[PDB]
């Protein structure tokens, strides 16, 4: 059996998956995650996969830091690296969801004239995080630590304007009867790295 290596976390809007190396050859893996409180909990048992979805555990407390470990076990009609005793494992880097999960790509839900403005509404994407029993939207999780930044321009001139909101609503001025294009981006101002999502697809009304 070959101990697992390159344990990395893949996380977007809290959906979290631990990945690792190598594709198994005559071995299976069992993954454990611990709320840094020590007490480990196996989540993926004797699998040939090289990834394990741990969303169920991290979303119990996104601000808490998490530790994971992958155990290697002999598989199939074979010997046993040792005496069928202490399997080869490996711990993962630490992971604090709130601070490290990537911000998913936003989606503009609609455009509507309101008074002399155009109301651009961002879809409040629900996540797997749950408080009391309700699935929390990304806004619920971050509160005001999340800003949506809008970019908009007339397709003819390409002159760009930008606006920000810490709700999911924008109220902006646009020249009447002109075709505009819009793109929205998510940002967590308090972060110093990985603070920006990729831009929503350009929508030219």
């Amino acid at each position, epitope marked *: 059996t070959v101990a697992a290596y390159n344990l990395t976390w893949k996380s977007t809007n809290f959906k979290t998956i631990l990945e690792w190396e190598p594709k198994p050859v005559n071995q299976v893996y069992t993954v454990q995650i611990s709320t840094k409180s020590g007490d480990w909990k196996s989540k993926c048992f004797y699998t040939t996969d090289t990834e394990c979805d741990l969303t169920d555990e991290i979303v119990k407390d996104v601000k808490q830091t998490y530790l994971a470990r992958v155990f290697s076990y002999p598989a199939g009609n074979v010997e046993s690296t040792g005496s069928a005793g202490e399997p080869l494992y490996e711990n993962s880097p630490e992971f604090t969801p709130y601070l490290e999960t990537n911000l998913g790509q936003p989606t503009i839900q609609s455009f509507e004239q309101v008074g002399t403005k155009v109301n651009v509404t961002v879809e409040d994407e629900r996540t797997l995080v749950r408080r009391n029993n309700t699935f929390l939207s990304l806004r619920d999780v971050f509160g005001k630590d999340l*800003i949506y930044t809008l970019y908009y321009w007339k397709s003819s001139s390409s*002159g*760009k*304007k*930008t606006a920000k909101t810490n709700t999911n609503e924008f109220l902006i001025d646009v020249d009447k009867g002109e075709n505009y294009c819009f793109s929205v*981006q998510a940002v967590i101002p308090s972060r110093t790295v990985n603070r920006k999502s990729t831009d929503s697809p350009v929508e030219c009304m």
Partner: antibody, heavy 117, light 108 residues
Framework: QVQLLESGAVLARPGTSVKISCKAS????????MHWVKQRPGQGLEWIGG????????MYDPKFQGRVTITADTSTSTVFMELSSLRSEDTAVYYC??????????WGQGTLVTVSS | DIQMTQSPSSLSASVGDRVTITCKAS??????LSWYQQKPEKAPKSLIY???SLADGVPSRFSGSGSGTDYTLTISSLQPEDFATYYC?????????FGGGTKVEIKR
């Protein structure tokens, strides 16, 4: 540690162009919005425009649109402001500033651009 | 476009005083109002953002207040290093606009 270092002072003749830069370090400029602010001798601060290096979008104040171009080079962590058809009113100190979303949290020390014949 | 009217353009104070500087926006800017301090020949420095949030390491002598169109920057227990020029900035939507500035000078 976050720092913004502006290129040196420059003298330019009326009608020509000038391109100043700002070297960022201690962070990735594609994670922020980089802006340029000018201050004429004895006057206040005035927003010129800025750029989002993650997508290339540049925004310019209507008064400068047409003769200012703001670009970024992510491989060298440098942002630039090029201003053309230079005139006297353009003589000023230009500051590079980082927009974190809620604030222009970091500023360069400013570059003096003198436009004179 | 949003206009910012900052006042007063100049104010006189003594060490220990409490002074208030105001910025009124031409429309509701939803607290995307920040304040900066600038001393002669120095670059501006962030004091307060999102109307009332004190920036990292900035003295508690600085506080901000407001929502809608009206905002204030108050400096309490005014200290010698506080005499300088102050600017508000609306940057919730471009074009971004600075107030005209307020120079806080020494009374005698």
């Amino acid at each position: 540690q976050v720092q913004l270092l502006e290129s040196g002072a420059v003298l330019a003749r009326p009608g020509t162009s000038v391109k100043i830069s700002c070297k960022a370090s201690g962070f990735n400029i594609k994670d922020y919005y980089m802006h340029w602010v000018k201050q004429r001798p004895g006057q206040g601060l005035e927003w010129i425009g800025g750029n989002d290096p993650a997508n290339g979008h540049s925004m310019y104040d209507p008064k400068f649109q047409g003769r200012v171009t703001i670009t970024a080079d992510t491989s060298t962590s440098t942002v630039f402001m090029e201003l053309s058809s230079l005139r006297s009113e353009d003589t000023a100190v230009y500051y590079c500033a980082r927009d974190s979303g809620y604030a222009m949290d970091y500023w360069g020390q400013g570059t003096l651009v003198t436009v004179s014949s | 476009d949003i206009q910012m009217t900052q006042s007063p353009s100049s104010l006189s104070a003594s060490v220990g005083d409490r002074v208030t500087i105001t910025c009124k926006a031409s429309q509701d800017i939803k607290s995307f109002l920040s304040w900066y301090q600038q001393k002669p020949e120095k670059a501006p420095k962030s004091l307060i953002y999102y109307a009332t949030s004190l920036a990292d390491g900035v003295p508690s002598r600085f506080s901000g207040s407001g929502s809608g169109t009206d905002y204030t920057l108050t400096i309490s227990s005014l200290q010698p290093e506080d005499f300088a020029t102050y600017y508000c900035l609306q940057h919730g939507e471009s074009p971004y606009t600075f107030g005209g500035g307020t120079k806080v000078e020494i009374k005698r």
